[PDB]
mmCIF file with all atom_site columns, C-alpha atoms in Angstrom:
data_model
loop_
_atom_site.group_PDB
_atom_site.id
_atom_site.type_symbol
_atom_site.label_atom_id
_atom_site.label_alt_id
_atom_site.label_comp_id
_atom_site.label_asym_id
_atom_site.label_entity_id
_atom_site.label_seq_id
_atom_site.pdbx_PDB_ins_code
_atom_site.Cartn_x
_atom_site.Cartn_y
_atom_site.Cartn_z
_atom_site.occupancy
_atom_site.B_iso_or_equiv
_atom_site.pdbx_formal_charge
_atom_site.auth_seq_id
_atom_site.auth_comp_id
_atom_site.auth_asym_id
_atom_site.auth_atom_id
_atom_site.pdbx_PDB_model_num
ATOM 1   C CA . UNK A 1 1   ? 11.666  10.617 -20.618 1.00 0.00 ? 398 UNK A CA 1
ATOM 2   C CA . UNK A 1 2   ? 10.122  8.794  -17.664 1.00 0.00 ? 399 UNK A CA 1
ATOM 3   C CA . UNK A 1 3   ? 11.805  5.377  -17.722 1.00 0.00 ? 400 UNK A CA 1
ATOM 4   C CA . UNK A 1 4   ? 10.126  2.070  -16.709 1.00 0.00 ? 401 UNK A CA 1
ATOM 5   C CA . UNK A 1 5   ? 12.323  2.195  -13.597 1.00 0.00 ? 402 UNK A CA 1
ATOM 6   C CA . UNK A 1 6   ? 13.235  5.464  -11.833 1.00 0.00 ? 403 UNK A CA 1
ATOM 7   C CA . UNK A 1 7   ? 15.465  6.155  -8.836  1.00 0.00 ? 404 UNK A CA 1
ATOM 8   C CA . UNK A 1 8   ? 14.622  8.589  -6.036  1.00 0.00 ? 405 UNK A CA 1
ATOM 9   C CA . UNK A 1 9   ? 16.568  11.037 -3.880  1.00 0.00 ? 406 UNK A CA 1
ATOM 10  C CA . UNK A 1 10  ? 14.933  13.388 -1.370  1.00 0.00 ? 407 UNK A CA 1
ATOM 11  C CA . UNK A 1 11  ? 15.539  15.706 1.558   1.00 0.00 ? 408 UNK A CA 1
ATOM 12  C CA . UNK A 1 12  ? 12.880  16.763 4.057   1.00 0.00 ? 409 UNK A CA 1
ATOM 13  C CA . UNK A 1 13  ? 13.351  19.534 6.592   1.00 0.00 ? 410 UNK A CA 1
ATOM 14  C CA . UNK A 1 14  ? 10.741  20.809 9.012   1.00 0.00 ? 411 UNK A CA 1
ATOM 15  C CA . UNK A 1 15  ? 9.252   21.095 12.490  1.00 0.00 ? 412 UNK A CA 1
ATOM 16  C CA . UNK A 1 16  ? 6.318   19.545 14.381  1.00 0.00 ? 413 UNK A CA 1
ATOM 17  C CA . UNK A 1 17  ? 5.046   21.129 17.606  1.00 0.00 ? 414 UNK A CA 1
ATOM 18  C CA . UNK A 1 18  ? 8.391   22.899 17.948  1.00 0.00 ? 415 UNK A CA 1
ATOM 19  C CA . UNK A 1 19  ? 10.630  19.881 17.314  1.00 0.00 ? 416 UNK A CA 1
ATOM 20  C CA . UNK A 1 20  ? 12.955  20.461 14.336  1.00 0.00 ? 417 UNK A CA 1
ATOM 21  C CA . UNK A 1 21  ? 14.163  17.625 12.105  1.00 0.00 ? 418 UNK A CA 1
ATOM 22  C CA . UNK A 1 22  ? 15.836  16.610 8.858   1.00 0.00 ? 419 UNK A CA 1
ATOM 23  C CA . UNK A 1 23  ? 15.306  13.405 6.894   1.00 0.00 ? 420 UNK A CA 1
ATOM 24  C CA . UNK A 1 24  ? 17.023  12.175 3.738   1.00 0.00 ? 421 UNK A CA 1
ATOM 25  C CA . UNK A 1 25  ? 15.927  9.294  1.547   1.00 0.00 ? 422 UNK A CA 1
ATOM 26  C CA . UNK A 1 26  ? 16.827  7.152  -1.416  1.00 0.00 ? 423 UNK A CA 1
ATOM 27  C CA . UNK A 1 27  ? 14.813  4.566  -3.318  1.00 0.00 ? 424 UNK A CA 1
ATOM 28  C CA . UNK A 1 28  ? 13.414  3.279  -6.591  1.00 0.00 ? 425 UNK A CA 1
ATOM 29  C CA . UNK A 1 29  ? 10.108  2.501  -8.303  1.00 0.00 ? 426 UNK A CA 1
ATOM 30  C CA . UNK A 1 30  ? 8.138   1.736  -11.456 1.00 0.00 ? 427 UNK A CA 1
ATOM 31  C CA . UNK A 1 31  ? 6.203   4.866  -12.533 1.00 0.00 ? 428 UNK A CA 1
ATOM 32  C CA . UNK A 1 32  ? 3.964   3.021  -15.017 1.00 0.00 ? 429 UNK A CA 1
ATOM 33  C CA . UNK A 1 33  ? 3.070   0.319  -12.496 1.00 0.00 ? 430 UNK A CA 1
ATOM 34  C CA . UNK A 1 34  ? 2.524   2.944  -9.779  1.00 0.00 ? 431 UNK A CA 1
ATOM 35  C CA . UNK A 1 35  ? 4.854   1.342  -7.220  1.00 0.00 ? 432 UNK A CA 1
ATOM 36  C CA . UNK A 1 36  ? 7.914   2.562  -5.320  1.00 0.00 ? 433 UNK A CA 1
ATOM 37  C CA . UNK A 1 37  ? 10.092  1.829  -2.289  1.00 0.00 ? 434 UNK A CA 1
ATOM 38  C CA . UNK A 1 38  ? 12.008  4.384  -0.206  1.00 0.00 ? 435 UNK A CA 1
ATOM 39  C CA . UNK A 1 39  ? 14.658  4.035  2.490   1.00 0.00 ? 436 UNK A CA 1
ATOM 40  C CA . UNK A 1 40  ? 14.492  7.037  4.811   1.00 0.00 ? 437 UNK A CA 1
ATOM 41  C CA . UNK A 1 41  ? 17.080  8.184  7.347   1.00 0.00 ? 438 UNK A CA 1
ATOM 42  C CA . UNK A 1 42  ? 16.682  10.797 10.094  1.00 0.00 ? 439 UNK A CA 1
ATOM 43  C CA . UNK A 1 43  ? 19.712  13.120 9.923   1.00 0.00 ? 440 UNK A CA 1
ATOM 44  C CA . UNK A 1 44  ? 18.666  15.693 12.517  1.00 0.00 ? 441 UNK A CA 1
ATOM 45  C CA . UNK A 1 45  ? 16.213  15.810 15.409  1.00 0.00 ? 442 UNK A CA 1
ATOM 46  C CA . UNK A 1 46  ? 16.459  12.121 16.284  1.00 0.00 ? 443 UNK A CA 1
ATOM 47  C CA . UNK A 1 47  ? 14.669  10.533 18.046  1.00 0.00 ? 444 UNK A CA 1
ATOM 48  C CA . UNK A 1 48  ? 11.412  11.907 16.632  1.00 0.00 ? 445 UNK A CA 1
ATOM 49  C CA . UNK A 1 49  ? 8.866   12.529 19.428  1.00 0.00 ? 446 UNK A CA 1
ATOM 50  C CA . UNK A 1 50  ? 5.856   12.276 17.074  1.00 0.00 ? 447 UNK A CA 1
ATOM 51  C CA . UNK A 1 51  ? 4.157   9.603  14.971  1.00 0.00 ? 448 UNK A CA 1
ATOM 52  C CA . UNK A 1 52  ? 6.232   8.887  11.872  1.00 0.00 ? 449 UNK A CA 1
ATOM 53  C CA . UNK A 1 53  ? 2.976   8.248  9.967   1.00 0.00 ? 450 UNK A CA 1
ATOM 54  C CA . UNK A 1 54  ? 2.115   11.950 9.610   1.00 0.00 ? 451 UNK A CA 1
ATOM 55  C CA . UNK A 1 55  ? 5.225   12.282 7.435   1.00 0.00 ? 452 UNK A CA 1
ATOM 56  C CA . UNK A 1 56  ? 4.919   9.385  5.028   1.00 0.00 ? 453 UNK A CA 1
ATOM 57  C CA . UNK A 1 57  ? 2.473   10.831 2.480   1.00 0.00 ? 454 UNK A CA 1
ATOM 58  C CA . UNK A 1 58  ? 4.984   13.710 2.039   1.00 0.00 ? 455 UNK A CA 1
ATOM 59  C CA . UNK A 1 59  ? 7.696   11.219 1.077   1.00 0.00 ? 456 UNK A CA 1
ATOM 60  C CA . UNK A 1 60  ? 5.275   11.896 -6.054  1.00 0.00 ? 457 UNK A CA 1
ATOM 61  C CA . UNK A 1 61  ? 2.254   11.100 -8.218  1.00 0.00 ? 458 UNK A CA 1
ATOM 62  C CA . UNK A 1 62  ? 4.593   10.286 -11.121 1.00 0.00 ? 459 UNK A CA 1
ATOM 63  C CA . UNK A 1 63  ? 4.474   6.869  -9.462  1.00 0.00 ? 460 UNK A CA 1
ATOM 64  C CA . UNK A 1 64  ? 0.844   6.219  -10.409 1.00 0.00 ? 461 UNK A CA 1
ATOM 65  C CA . UNK A 1 65  ? -0.556  3.660  -12.853 1.00 0.00 ? 462 UNK A CA 1
ATOM 66  C CA . UNK A 1 66  ? -2.549  5.766  -15.342 1.00 0.00 ? 463 UNK A CA 1
ATOM 67  C CA . UNK A 1 67  ? -4.736  4.169  -18.013 1.00 0.00 ? 464 UNK A CA 1
ATOM 68  C CA . UNK A 1 68  ? -4.478  5.372  -21.616 1.00 0.00 ? 465 UNK A CA 1
ATOM 69  C CA . UNK A 1 69  ? -7.841  7.170  -21.618 1.00 0.00 ? 466 UNK A CA 1
ATOM 70  C CA . UNK A 1 70  ? -6.874  9.477  -18.708 1.00 0.00 ? 467 UNK A CA 1
ATOM 71  C CA . UNK A 1 71  ? -4.279  12.227 -19.304 1.00 0.00 ? 468 UNK A CA 1
ATOM 72  C CA . UNK A 1 72  ? -1.319  11.688 -16.953 1.00 0.00 ? 469 UNK A CA 1
ATOM 73  C CA . UNK A 1 73  ? -0.839  15.182 -15.557 1.00 0.00 ? 470 UNK A CA 1
ATOM 74  C CA . UNK A 1 74  ? 2.273   14.144 -13.610 1.00 0.00 ? 471 UNK A CA 1
ATOM 75  C CA . UNK A 1 75  ? 4.364   12.238 -16.146 1.00 0.00 ? 472 UNK A CA 1
ATOM 76  C CA . UNK A 1 76  ? 3.611   14.952 -18.735 1.00 0.00 ? 473 UNK A CA 1
ATOM 77  C CA . UNK A 1 77  ? 5.216   17.536 -16.446 1.00 0.00 ? 474 UNK A CA 1
ATOM 78  C CA . UNK A 1 78  ? 8.731   16.157 -17.020 1.00 0.00 ? 475 UNK A CA 1
ATOM 79  C CA . UNK A 1 79  ? 11.629  16.640 -17.667 1.00 0.00 ? 476 UNK A CA 1
ATOM 80  C CA . UNK A 1 80  ? 10.778  20.124 -16.336 1.00 0.00 ? 477 UNK A CA 1
ATOM 81  C CA . UNK A 1 81  ? 8.987   18.607 -13.346 1.00 0.00 ? 478 UNK A CA 1
ATOM 82  C CA . UNK A 1 82  ? 6.359   19.940 -10.971 1.00 0.00 ? 479 UNK A CA 1
ATOM 83  C CA . UNK A 1 83  ? 5.612   20.919 -7.376  1.00 0.00 ? 480 UNK A CA 1
ATOM 84  C CA . UNK A 1 84  ? 2.776   20.396 -4.928  1.00 0.00 ? 481 UNK A CA 1
ATOM 85  C CA . UNK A 1 85  ? 1.305   22.188 -1.907  1.00 0.00 ? 482 UNK A CA 1
ATOM 86  C CA . UNK A 1 86  ? -0.619  20.246 0.737   1.00 0.00 ? 483 UNK A CA 1
ATOM 87  C CA . UNK A 1 87  ? -2.628  20.980 3.852   1.00 0.00 ? 484 UNK A CA 1
ATOM 88  C CA . UNK A 1 88  ? -3.425  18.190 6.294   1.00 0.00 ? 485 UNK A CA 1
ATOM 89  C CA . UNK A 1 89  ? -6.153  19.003 8.844   1.00 0.00 ? 486 UNK A CA 1
ATOM 90  C CA . UNK A 1 90  ? -6.642  16.519 11.709  1.00 0.00 ? 487 UNK A CA 1
ATOM 91  C CA . UNK A 1 91  ? -9.958  16.114 13.534  1.00 0.00 ? 488 UNK A CA 1
ATOM 92  C CA . UNK A 1 92  ? -8.536  17.232 16.910  1.00 0.00 ? 489 UNK A CA 1
ATOM 93  C CA . UNK A 1 93  ? -7.380  20.505 15.258  1.00 0.00 ? 490 UNK A CA 1
ATOM 94  C CA . UNK A 1 94  ? -3.805  19.356 14.674  1.00 0.00 ? 491 UNK A CA 1
ATOM 95  C CA . UNK A 1 95  ? -2.675  20.904 11.365  1.00 0.00 ? 492 UNK A CA 1
ATOM 96  C CA . UNK A 1 96  ? 0.214   20.174 8.980   1.00 0.00 ? 493 UNK A CA 1
ATOM 97  C CA . UNK A 1 97  ? 1.236   21.879 5.720   1.00 0.00 ? 494 UNK A CA 1
ATOM 98  C CA . UNK A 1 98  ? 3.863   20.687 3.221   1.00 0.00 ? 495 UNK A CA 1
ATOM 99  C CA . UNK A 1 99  ? 5.499   21.570 -0.090  1.00 0.00 ? 496 UNK A CA 1
ATOM 100 C CA . UNK A 1 100 ? 7.655   19.561 -2.461  1.00 0.00 ? 497 UNK A CA 1
ATOM 101 C CA . UNK A 1 101 ? 9.652   20.648 -5.489  1.00 0.00 ? 498 UNK A CA 1
ATOM 102 C CA . UNK A 1 102 ? 10.220  17.697 -7.834  1.00 0.00 ? 499 UNK A CA 1
ATOM 103 C CA . UNK A 1 103 ? 12.838  17.779 -10.590 1.00 0.00 ? 500 UNK A CA 1
ATOM 104 C CA . UNK A 1 104 ? 14.563  15.146 -12.712 1.00 0.00 ? 501 UNK A CA 1
ATOM 105 C CA . UNK A 1 105 ? 18.022  14.193 -13.929 1.00 0.00 ? 502 UNK A CA 1
ATOM 106 C CA . UNK A 1 106 ? 18.691  11.096 -16.003 1.00 0.00 ? 503 UNK A CA 1
ATOM 107 C CA . UNK A 1 107 ? 16.851  8.224  -14.337 1.00 0.00 ? 504 UNK A CA 1
ATOM 108 C CA . UNK A 1 108 ? 16.402  9.802  -10.907 1.00 0.00 ? 505 UNK A CA 1
ATOM 109 C CA . UNK A 1 109 ? 13.730  11.986 -9.298  1.00 0.00 ? 506 UNK A CA 1
ATOM 110 C CA . UNK A 1 110 ? 14.845  14.654 -6.819  1.00 0.00 ? 507 UNK A CA 1
ATOM 111 C CA . UNK A 1 111 ? 12.560  16.011 -4.070  1.00 0.00 ? 508 UNK A CA 1
ATOM 112 C CA . UNK A 1 112 ? 13.105  19.076 -1.914  1.00 0.00 ? 509 UNK A CA 1
ATOM 113 C CA . UNK A 1 113 ? 10.458  18.846 0.822   1.00 0.00 ? 510 UNK A CA 1
ATOM 114 C CA . UNK A 1 114 ? 9.328   21.262 3.557   1.00 0.00 ? 511 UNK A CA 1
ATOM 115 C CA . UNK A 1 115 ? 7.056   19.926 6.326   1.00 0.00 ? 512 UNK A CA 1
ATOM 116 C CA . UNK A 1 116 ? 5.452   21.754 9.247   1.00 0.00 ? 513 UNK A CA 1
ATOM 117 C CA . UNK A 1 117 ? 2.891   20.807 11.858  1.00 0.00 ? 514 UNK A CA 1
ATOM 118 C CA . UNK A 1 118 ? 1.442   22.413 14.960  1.00 0.00 ? 515 UNK A CA 1
ATOM 119 C CA . UNK A 1 119 ? -1.328  22.460 17.575  1.00 0.00 ? 516 UNK A CA 1
ATOM 120 C CA . UNK A 1 120 ? -1.228  18.704 18.175  1.00 0.00 ? 517 UNK A CA 1
ATOM 121 C CA . UNK A 1 121 ? -2.607  17.876 21.654  1.00 0.00 ? 518 UNK A CA 1
ATOM 122 C CA . UNK A 1 122 ? 0.343   16.797 23.837  1.00 0.00 ? 519 UNK A CA 1
ATOM 123 C CA . UNK A 1 123 ? -1.566  13.661 24.892  1.00 0.00 ? 520 UNK A CA 1
ATOM 124 C CA . UNK A 1 124 ? -3.057  13.033 21.441  1.00 0.00 ? 521 UNK A CA 1
ATOM 125 C CA . UNK A 1 125 ? -2.359  10.008 19.194  1.00 0.00 ? 522 UNK A CA 1
ATOM 126 C CA . UNK A 1 126 ? 0.345   11.888 17.249  1.00 0.00 ? 523 UNK A CA 1
ATOM 127 C CA . UNK A 1 127 ? 2.540   13.173 20.107  1.00 0.00 ? 524 UNK A CA 1
ATOM 128 C CA . UNK A 1 128 ? 1.991   9.937  22.049  1.00 0.00 ? 525 UNK A CA 1
ATOM 129 C CA . UNK A 1 129 ? 2.770   7.780  18.983  1.00 0.00 ? 526 UNK A CA 1
ATOM 130 C CA . UNK A 1 130 ? -0.471  5.771  19.052  1.00 0.00 ? 527 UNK A CA 1
ATOM 131 C CA . UNK A 1 131 ? -0.906  5.391  15.263  1.00 0.00 ? 528 UNK A CA 1
ATOM 132 C CA . UNK A 1 132 ? -0.479  1.995  13.590  1.00 0.00 ? 529 UNK A CA 1
ATOM 133 C CA . UNK A 1 133 ? -0.861  2.965  9.921   1.00 0.00 ? 530 UNK A CA 1
ATOM 134 C CA . UNK A 1 134 ? -2.823  4.872  7.306   1.00 0.00 ? 531 UNK A CA 1
ATOM 135 C CA . UNK A 1 135 ? -5.893  3.170  5.900   1.00 0.00 ? 532 UNK A CA 1
ATOM 136 C CA . UNK A 1 136 ? -5.787  2.731  2.138   1.00 0.00 ? 533 UNK A CA 1
ATOM 137 C CA . UNK A 1 137 ? -7.522  5.689  0.462   1.00 0.00 ? 534 UNK A CA 1
ATOM 138 C CA . UNK A 1 138 ? -9.126  7.115  -2.668  1.00 0.00 ? 535 UNK A CA 1
ATOM 139 C CA . UNK A 1 139 ? -8.012  10.613 -3.686  1.00 0.00 ? 536 UNK A CA 1
ATOM 140 C CA . UNK A 1 140 ? -10.367 12.617 -5.884  1.00 0.00 ? 537 UNK A CA 1
ATOM 141 C CA . UNK A 1 141 ? -8.577  14.548 -8.628  1.00 0.00 ? 538 UNK A CA 1
ATOM 142 C CA . UNK A 1 142 ? -10.193 17.618 -10.231 1.00 0.00 ? 539 UNK A CA 1
ATOM 143 C CA . UNK A 1 143 ? -9.054  20.719 -12.115 1.00 0.00 ? 540 UNK A CA 1
ATOM 144 C CA . UNK A 1 144 ? -9.247  24.260 -10.707 1.00 0.00 ? 541 UNK A CA 1
ATOM 145 C CA . UNK A 1 145 ? -7.429  27.493 -11.588 1.00 0.00 ? 542 UNK A CA 1
ATOM 146 C CA . UNK A 1 146 ? -5.849  25.615 -14.498 1.00 0.00 ? 543 UNK A CA 1
ATOM 147 C CA . UNK A 1 147 ? -4.013  23.209 -12.201 1.00 0.00 ? 544 UNK A CA 1
ATOM 148 C CA . UNK A 1 148 ? -4.824  19.803 -10.695 1.00 0.00 ? 545 UNK A CA 1
ATOM 149 C CA . UNK A 1 149 ? -6.358  19.551 -7.229  1.00 0.00 ? 546 UNK A CA 1
ATOM 150 C CA . UNK A 1 150 ? -6.460  16.472 -5.016  1.00 0.00 ? 547 UNK A CA 1
ATOM 151 C CA . UNK A 1 151 ? -8.767  15.826 -2.042  1.00 0.00 ? 548 UNK A CA 1
ATOM 152 C CA . UNK A 1 152 ? -8.750  12.667 0.083   1.00 0.00 ? 549 UNK A CA 1
ATOM 153 C CA . UNK A 1 153 ? -10.336 11.614 3.356   1.00 0.00 ? 550 UNK A CA 1
ATOM 154 C CA . UNK A 1 154 ? -7.477  9.988  5.251   1.00 0.00 ? 551 UNK A CA 1
ATOM 155 C CA . UNK A 1 155 ? -7.612  7.930  8.435   1.00 0.00 ? 552 UNK A CA 1
ATOM 156 C CA . UNK A 1 156 ? -5.007  6.603  10.846  1.00 0.00 ? 553 UNK A CA 1
ATOM 157 C CA . UNK A 1 157 ? -5.769  3.285  12.503  1.00 0.00 ? 554 UNK A CA 1
ATOM 158 C CA . UNK A 1 158 ? -5.116  3.665  16.233  1.00 0.00 ? 555 UNK A CA 1
ATOM 159 C CA . UNK A 1 159 ? -3.425  1.557  18.901  1.00 0.00 ? 556 UNK A CA 1
ATOM 160 C CA . UNK A 1 160 ? -6.181  0.251  21.158  1.00 0.00 ? 557 UNK A CA 1
ATOM 161 C CA . UNK A 1 161 ? -8.744  0.507  18.361  1.00 0.00 ? 558 UNK A CA 1
ATOM 162 C CA . UNK A 1 162 ? -10.554 3.251  16.458  1.00 0.00 ? 559 UNK A CA 1
ATOM 163 C CA . UNK A 1 163 ? -9.571  5.702  13.740  1.00 0.00 ? 560 UNK A CA 1
ATOM 164 C CA . UNK A 1 164 ? -8.054  9.177  13.646  1.00 0.00 ? 561 UNK A CA 1
ATOM 165 C CA . UNK A 1 165 ? -9.258  11.288 10.710  1.00 0.00 ? 562 UNK A CA 1
ATOM 166 C CA . UNK A 1 166 ? -7.442  13.869 8.568   1.00 0.00 ? 563 UNK A CA 1
ATOM 167 C CA . UNK A 1 167 ? -8.527  15.769 5.442   1.00 0.00 ? 564 UNK A CA 1
ATOM 168 C CA . UNK A 1 168 ? -5.829  16.283 2.782   1.00 0.00 ? 565 UNK A CA 1
ATOM 169 C CA . UNK A 1 169 ? -6.074  19.109 0.235   1.00 0.00 ? 566 UNK A CA 1
ATOM 170 C CA . UNK A 1 170 ? -3.358  19.163 -2.416  1.00 0.00 ? 567 UNK A CA 1
ATOM 171 C CA . UNK A 1 171 ? -2.617  21.430 -5.363  1.00 0.00 ? 568 UNK A CA 1
ATOM 172 C CA . UNK A 1 172 ? -0.327  20.009 -8.060  1.00 0.00 ? 569 UNK A CA 1
ATOM 173 C CA . UNK A 1 173 ? 1.462   22.559 -10.278 1.00 0.00 ? 570 UNK A CA 1
ATOM 174 C CA . UNK A 1 174 ? 3.210   21.456 -13.481 1.00 0.00 ? 571 UNK A CA 1
ATOM 175 C CA . UNK A 1 175 ? 6.108   23.709 -14.502 1.00 0.00 ? 572 UNK A CA 1
ATOM 176 C CA . UNK A 1 176 ? 4.939   23.689 -18.123 1.00 0.00 ? 573 UNK A CA 1
ATOM 177 C CA . UNK A 1 177 ? 1.523   23.356 -19.778 1.00 0.00 ? 574 UNK A CA 1
ATOM 178 C CA . UNK A 1 178 ? 0.136   19.842 -20.230 1.00 0.00 ? 575 UNK A CA 1
ATOM 179 C CA . UNK A 1 179 ? -3.084  18.115 -21.248 1.00 0.00 ? 576 UNK A CA 1
ATOM 180 C CA . UNK A 1 180 ? -5.489  18.572 -18.339 1.00 0.00 ? 577 UNK A CA 1
ATOM 181 C CA . UNK A 1 181 ? -7.457  15.447 -17.333 1.00 0.00 ? 578 UNK A CA 1
ATOM 182 C CA . UNK A 1 182 ? -11.151 15.217 -16.465 1.00 0.00 ? 579 UNK A CA 1
ATOM 183 C CA . UNK A 1 183 ? -12.112 14.573 -12.836 1.00 0.00 ? 580 UNK A CA 1
ATOM 184 C CA . UNK A 1 184 ? -11.046 11.111 -11.663 1.00 0.00 ? 581 UNK A CA 1
ATOM 185 C CA . UNK A 1 185 ? -9.814  9.114  -8.679  1.00 0.00 ? 582 UNK A CA 1
ATOM 186 C CA . UNK A 1 186 ? -6.516  7.751  -7.412  1.00 0.00 ? 583 UNK A CA 1
ATOM 187 C CA . UNK A 1 187 ? -6.504  4.720  -5.123  1.00 0.00 ? 584 UNK A CA 1
ATOM 188 C CA . UNK A 1 188 ? -3.669  4.678  -2.576  1.00 0.00 ? 585 UNK A CA 1
ATOM 189 C CA . UNK A 1 189 ? -2.076  2.237  -0.182  1.00 0.00 ? 586 UNK A CA 1
ATOM 190 C CA . UNK A 1 190 ? 0.970   3.468  1.709   1.00 0.00 ? 587 UNK A CA 1
ATOM 191 C CA . UNK A 1 191 ? 2.657   1.395  4.411   1.00 0.00 ? 588 UNK A CA 1
ATOM 192 C CA . UNK A 1 192 ? 5.882   1.134  6.396   1.00 0.00 ? 589 UNK A CA 1
ATOM 193 C CA . UNK A 1 193 ? 7.463   -2.186 5.448   1.00 0.00 ? 590 UNK A CA 1
ATOM 194 C CA . UNK A 1 194 ? 10.088  -2.017 8.183   1.00 0.00 ? 591 UNK A CA 1
ATOM 195 C CA . UNK A 1 195 ? 11.866  0.292  10.623  1.00 0.00 ? 592 UNK A CA 1
ATOM 196 C CA . UNK A 1 196 ? 14.244  0.412  13.594  1.00 0.00 ? 593 UNK A CA 1
ATOM 197 C CA . UNK A 1 197 ? 12.901  1.073  17.082  1.00 0.00 ? 594 UNK A CA 1
ATOM 198 C CA . UNK A 1 198 ? 13.165  4.885  16.966  1.00 0.00 ? 595 UNK A CA 1
ATOM 199 C CA . UNK A 1 199 ? 12.129  5.133  13.285  1.00 0.00 ? 596 UNK A CA 1
ATOM 200 C CA . UNK A 1 200 ? 15.555  6.622  12.548  1.00 0.00 ? 597 UNK A CA 1
ATOM 201 C CA . UNK A 1 201 ? 15.580  4.309  9.541   1.00 0.00 ? 598 UNK A CA 1
ATOM 202 C CA . UNK A 1 202 ? 12.367  3.429  7.712   1.00 0.00 ? 599 UNK A CA 1
ATOM 203 C CA . UNK A 1 203 ? 11.476  1.465  4.576   1.00 0.00 ? 600 UNK A CA 1
ATOM 204 C CA . UNK A 1 204 ? 8.364   2.951  2.940   1.00 0.00 ? 601 UNK A CA 1
ATOM 205 C CA . UNK A 1 205 ? 6.139   1.666  0.134   1.00 0.00 ? 602 UNK A CA 1
ATOM 206 C CA . UNK A 1 206 ? 3.229   3.060  -1.891  1.00 0.00 ? 603 UNK A CA 1
ATOM 207 C CA . UNK A 1 207 ? 0.972   1.578  -4.542  1.00 0.00 ? 604 UNK A CA 1
ATOM 208 C CA . UNK A 1 208 ? -1.186  3.991  -6.579  1.00 0.00 ? 605 UNK A CA 1
ATOM 209 C CA . UNK A 1 209 ? -3.486  3.638  -9.602  1.00 0.00 ? 606 UNK A CA 1
ATOM 210 C CA . UNK A 1 210 ? -5.721  6.178  -11.331 1.00 0.00 ? 607 UNK A CA 1
ATOM 211 C CA . UNK A 1 211 ? -9.268  5.415  -12.517 1.00 0.00 ? 608 UNK A CA 1
ATOM 212 C CA . UNK A 1 212 ? -12.801 6.682  -13.061 1.00 0.00 ? 609 UNK A CA 1
ATOM 213 C CA . UNK A 1 213 ? -15.716 5.642  -10.852 1.00 0.00 ? 610 UNK A CA 1
ATOM 214 C CA . UNK A 1 214 ? -16.358 1.909  -11.126 1.00 0.00 ? 611 UNK A CA 1
ATOM 215 C CA . UNK A 1 215 ? -20.127 2.414  -11.017 1.00 0.00 ? 612 UNK A CA 1
ATOM 216 C CA . UNK A 1 216 ? -22.006 2.885  -14.323 1.00 0.00 ? 613 UNK A CA 1
ATOM 217 C CA . UNK A 1 217 ? -24.076 5.980  -15.156 1.00 0.00 ? 614 UNK A CA 1
ATOM 218 C CA . UNK A 1 218 ? -27.767 6.161  -16.089 1.00 0.00 ? 615 UNK A CA 1
#
């Protein structure tokens, strides 16, 4: 069902500190290698007055390299698909929440995404666009309420030095029952490969692989 190469189409709509926007995207990736590339285009609300980086993790764990001995919760969820719900709490009390509904048709994934953020300090790194990128991360996956949870300590590298921290909490909901995995980790590295000056057009890339702890047990 999930082919070695899968196309992507998405639409995001939302608001951040009052500013409304719409973004559409198209791309392609290799779900079994855990890699993907997206070309994103702002359709409404341009030019964005906030850091584009807060958006990028919202732009599909189907694109994750899973080893054989770990049930792949995400690929199992198709063709029916799945959704996720995510809260993103920044250390200066900025807060974002997002939802995505992910379906499938042929060799293409379709995302419908809602994104909302508020309470960002007007002179903070987000509203002043002082973020350079996300650090690579490790997301801890664990089961609760019969669905898969994901928690990851995220950090934005800042212009002029230092980091800006955010805690992600995600709930992944498959639309049909699947084999539930044991607790494990997912390494991430997301990064903007290119963009125009106002980030109206952005090329976005993620690499993800699932694994257990690399340390042995006594």
